[PDB]
Copies of this chain bind each other. A is one copy, B any other.
């Protein structure tokens, strides 16, 4: 019940997308549980255990679609839970939580560097790469390919409604990479000059489907139409455990004013509904490879990544639940 302010501020900052990107919100959430355990004034283990459960619930209940976030929380709290239930005293608990969270953060950072190097071998000198939204994993691949001296150009899609495309373009251009910026609508038109597509992921399902930023399934579709390789750069913690047992992933519907600003929308008629899905779902048939920190897989090998990292936990409850 004695939740420190950094937990609430991180939760809010995930909700408002001031902190965004599936990897980042997962690291931020691990960091929040880390600080809760740093600054906790609890005396008993039972007390700190209970603070960490509640912090974890607050953080889970921010944004639903990227399983990166629950997987972060799980990574920390499977360990914290095993400690507490094994009889660890206060400081043995405090450290288990803090250290588990530090592990996840470090492993996330290393995973992304690694995805960069693996994916870059798939990029060739002269390539024109089209990307969508702003994905650290995808940018790692493109950045690495450029540092290897491959002379590349990236077609960056603006990525409505929230313009993540702007971030992507200034970022790649600041590393020296030539950028071509277009609207989402122009993806087919420019698919004819594109050699490779590199996008990220928020959740990957057991059958190989990729839930990523709205628009992704379209770029994928047309890439298939033209035989351009769709490469999804994604850490293993993007893979979605509960899809193993039949769960559909929730698609986050965000506020209509991200599309039509409040000052404008209030003046619009009542029979207009504005629908603002945050993600769509791309089928495995439109994906060439998924580049994980453990290597290149075909998208249908997602079930293998999950069988072996994740499946064990599905017979238990979540490690923050009563």
Contact = CB atoms under 8 A, between A and B. Distances in A.
Given A215-B184, A277-B189, A298 B207 contact: yes
Given A297-B206, A298-B207, A300-B301, A180 B225 contact: no
A82 interface: no
A245 B120 CA distance: 10
Contacts of A275: 180-182, 186, 190
Contacts of A298: 206-208, 284, 300, 302-303
B300 A188 contact: no
- The A interface, classified by DSSP as helix, strand, loop or mixed, is mixed
A259 B170 CA distance: 15
Interface string A29-63: 00000000000000000000000000000000000
A158 B259 contact: yes
Contacts of A178: 271-273
Interface in A60-80: none
Given A177-B271, A271-B179, A217 B246 contact: no
B222 A218 contact: yes
The count of identical subunits is 6
A187 interface: yes
A229 to B, nearest CB: 9
A179 B273 contact: yes
A274 B166 CA distance: 11
A182 B302 CA distance: 31
A192 B228 CA distance: 9
A181 to B, nearest CB: 5
Nearest to A285: B285
A221 to B, nearest CB: 6
Nearest to A296: B206
A206 B311 CA distance: 22
Contacts of A190: 275
Contact of A226 (B121, B182, B226, B288): B226
Contacts of A319: none
A170 B272 contact: yes
A309 to B, nearest CB: 13
Contact of A280 (B189, B226, B269, B295): B189
Contacts of A158: 160, 259
Nearest to A273: B180
A90 interface: no
Interface in A202-245: 206-208, 213-215, 217-218, 221-222, 225-227, 243-245
Contacts of A120: 246
8 contacts: A118-B245, A121-B247, A169-B268, A169-B272, A184-B185, A185-B218, A189-B281, A207-B288
